[PDB]
Design a protein around this ligand. Sequence first.
Ligand code: HEM
Ligand SMILES: CC(C)(C)OC(=O)N[C@H](CN[C@H](Cc1ccccc1)C(=O)NCc1cccnc1)Cc1ccccc1
Length: 451
Amino acid sequence: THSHGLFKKLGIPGPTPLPFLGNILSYHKGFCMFDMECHKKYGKVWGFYDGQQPVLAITDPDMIKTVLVKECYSVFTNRRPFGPVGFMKSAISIAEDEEWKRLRSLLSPTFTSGKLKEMVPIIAQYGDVLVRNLRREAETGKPVTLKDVFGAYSMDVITSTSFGVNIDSLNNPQDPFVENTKKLPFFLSITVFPFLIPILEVLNICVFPREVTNFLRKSVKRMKESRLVDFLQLMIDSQNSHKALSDLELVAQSIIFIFAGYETTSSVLSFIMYELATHPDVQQKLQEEIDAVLPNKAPPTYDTVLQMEYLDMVVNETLRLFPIAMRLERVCKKDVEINGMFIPKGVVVMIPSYALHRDPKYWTEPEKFLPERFSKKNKDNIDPYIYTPFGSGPRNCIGMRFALMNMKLALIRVLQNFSFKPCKETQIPLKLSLGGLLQPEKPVVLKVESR
Ligand code: HEM
Ligand SMILES: CC(C)(C)OC(=O)N[C@H](CN[C@H](Cc1ccccc1)C(=O)NCc1cccnc1)Cc1ccccc1
């Protein structure tokens, strides 16, 4: 401090920072709107200050491939530290440098195409629970709240795919497991006072409600010492060139997988049905493709799901409009030059996916939901360093292939059985949380009718 001079020195444009806040007052309309403005105001690069912390935004595809891929192990290894985390410092999304490189290795074979193929029968069963739970609301010509029935499904898939537990969390009861995973303004006060993190690190306040973490540390070792197909097993099978996964490190990845697979898989299926509700020709065209591949509502399989090319298109286009990570970020750990531009040590480099996904300069009619931009005809003209819903490089979304599968096995089973109609209480056009998450302002609600 006052570091507020640093992009004025390097000759890089940007909104002027108020002392101690940087430009965080500019986050009132949301991260996403701030980015699209600074994109149009300033060009290919710009910078702003979260409190005292310099963030340099980059939009050049080569410069992005340099950062995410070429210069990753060397310069851009870690993301921006947030806290207090406590024992979750050992989670993979959060660890740094060699403790991350190690965790990546030990957890990479779990996410293989081969491992995921053996998960398909387990992920199939809870699509059925999803249909009956949906039917009891479809036979009752009353509108349905999507994040609930999709959250109950998203939840049903995680506990089973990561620990073996088997519930119908929607109805089936206060089963000992549904409630600690329930408790999945403070995170703004970190940005002006990041010097208060180590304060909170010595005070063992956990952003993870300390209790939940106490429930699963013991619940993991209950399962650990009972058995002695799922994530906890493929992890336990690994700890039998790197020191092996400890017992609290394993609990912490189990947690990272529960966070990951829950409100992401749930919120995306929301955004996709909304798109499918308010665009009923795409709904029918997909319903057709599903019935040609799986006649008579034939149960989907691994291979049949990678077969549906329109299903992939609807998914990708929905994610282009709703890249639920909004931004990608890496901390620059050395003085470096990349594609002819100096970036000093400590800067946080940021890629505004949601800006790029909705940039007219690459996307014709970007606000329109148009799945044909991913036709095998047109899918080739898409710069993979513009469309980046799962990141890129060695730090990208490790769960990429599984989420895509899990979400697609949800849609197939549901669009075989129901058609989805707008209700008078549907928010149209849907509006994004002015807040800090990519979710709908008003929850997505729609009419469900049985085919
Ligand atoms: C629609 C679903 C999902 C989307 C869009 C998504 C997206 C992302 C993105 C953008 C990143 C950051 C990539 C980067 O930093 O360049 C990420 C990281 C990560 N994701 Fe996903 N994710 C999804 C679901 C999941 C699921 C189901 C898991 C299951 C375990 C998962 C596990 C992770 C982990 C562990 C990381 C941190 C990677 C690391 O630090 O090495 N994600 N995800
Ligand atoms: C803005 C601040 C700093 C306050 O929120 C974050 O801490 N960040 C987000 C979520 N963090 C979680 C871990 C987490 C989340 C909330 C509370 C406590 C612990 C993560 O790592 N979940 C794996 C996962 C997530 C989403 C897609 N796929 C996999 C978003 C994010 C983006 C990219 C990678 C990781 C996380």
